[PDB]
């Protein structure tokens, strides 16, 4: 035993350096956290929109004070999780971005979402069991047996429409299935996509279908589609257009470029001849079912 005292003396010197090492970084946290809570106590965050992310690394944003800003240094958020078109919470004076704010959802879109579960059951609906059956299997089974449609292998049906006399029960099935399935039910009014300013109803379409894109179990309802679904017409000197704008993004945003099978559409009208046949094609609205008048027995059943 000769060198164990020298190497043990060196190891004891290394632990004696470890004491001032843990004390060194443990002293190093205070002065950096003191300015970290200084830039975090600036909690009023002037949010912006990420215009562009440079490569000569840098970025340009625009605050919602309509003010553009170049910056050389990004900040606490790195460049990799960012992209042009985002929206972040930014320091006021430095104009230095700090956080990542998630979404851009309108309050009217938040009003569209139910949280009530209006309880209805199918034996409260007598004498419509064919339309009830083909309605339920067209929506519920692409939400519970997906490998059954993939077993044979087909794209599942997409878009159902109900039409008929306005007293035959059309809201009733929607509130029924809204009580049945435990998904993100989302309802719409007819002239709800009608705005004074231009483009607001169209952005209201893409925001709602962005939210229904987000909730992957989700189905969308439309009541009284003919308020917006008026057939177009060629007219000089006059004629509305703005409703047909939102109708056209309802067409394209519904079906066409970049489709998906995540939402199912339930549309309710009473009159058909007003409607533009562009939504009546085959695939935008697949299953067009009418609700006739009760024969005798369903009249006994309702009362």
């Amino acid at each position: 035993r000769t060198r164990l005292l020298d190497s043990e003396i060196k190891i004891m010197k290394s632990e004696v350096l470890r004491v001032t090492h843990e004390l060194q970084a443990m002293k190093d946290k205070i002065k950096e956290n003191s300015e970290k809570i200084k830039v975090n106590k600036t909690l009023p965050y002037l949010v912006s929109n990420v215009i562009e992310l440079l490569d000569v690394k840098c970025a340009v944003i625009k605050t919602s004070t309509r003010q553009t800003y170049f910056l050389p240094v990004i900040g606490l958020v790195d460049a990799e999780k960012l992209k042009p078109g985002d929206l972040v919470g930014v320091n006021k004076d430095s104009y230095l971005i700090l956080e990542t704010l998630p979404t851009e959802y309108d309050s009217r879109v938040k009003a569209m979402e139910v949280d009530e579960r209006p309880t209805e059951q199918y034996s409260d609906i007598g004498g419509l069991d064919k339309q009830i059956q083909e309605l339920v299997e067209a929506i519920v089974l692409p939400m519970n047996h997906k490998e059954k449609f993939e077993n044979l292998g087909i794209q599942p049906p997409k878009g159902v429409l109900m039409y008929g006399p306005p007293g035959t029960g059309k809201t009733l099935l929607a509130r029924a299935c809204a009580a049945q399935t435990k998904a993100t039910f989302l309802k719409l009014a007819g002239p709800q996509l009608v705005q004074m300013f231009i483009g607001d109803g169209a952005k209201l379409v893409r925001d709602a279908f962005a939210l229904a894109k987000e909730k992957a179990p989700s189905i969308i309802f439309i009541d009284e589609l003919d308020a917006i679904g008026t057939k177009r017409f060629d007219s000089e000197k006059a004629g509305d257009r703005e409703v047909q704008r939102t109708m056209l993004e309802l067409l394209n945003q519904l079906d066409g470029f970049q489709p998906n099978t995540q939402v199912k559409v339930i549309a309710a009208t009473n009159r058909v001849d007003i409607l533009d046949p562009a939504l009546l094609r085959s695939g935008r609205l697949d299953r067009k079912i009418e609700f006739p008048m009760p024969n005798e027995e369903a009249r006994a059943r309702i009362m």
Partner: protein, 48 residues
């Protein structure tokens, strides 16, 4: 006075909105509970 866009989970960290100007992450006072600061609501907000 302003208008609330939304809150977030785990934290107050409110998202506010005003008439023309930009949008901020804002906070309560000590005088009120976070209960009736529900989303889509007008609130009186100090200038500083």
């Amino acid at each position: 006075c302003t208008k609330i866009i939304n809150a977030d989970s785990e934290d107050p960290k409110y998202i506010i909105n005003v008439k023309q100007f930009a949008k901020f992450v804002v906070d309560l006072s000590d005088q009120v509970a976070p209960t009736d600061i529900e989303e889509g609501m007008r609130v009186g907000v100090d200038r500083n």
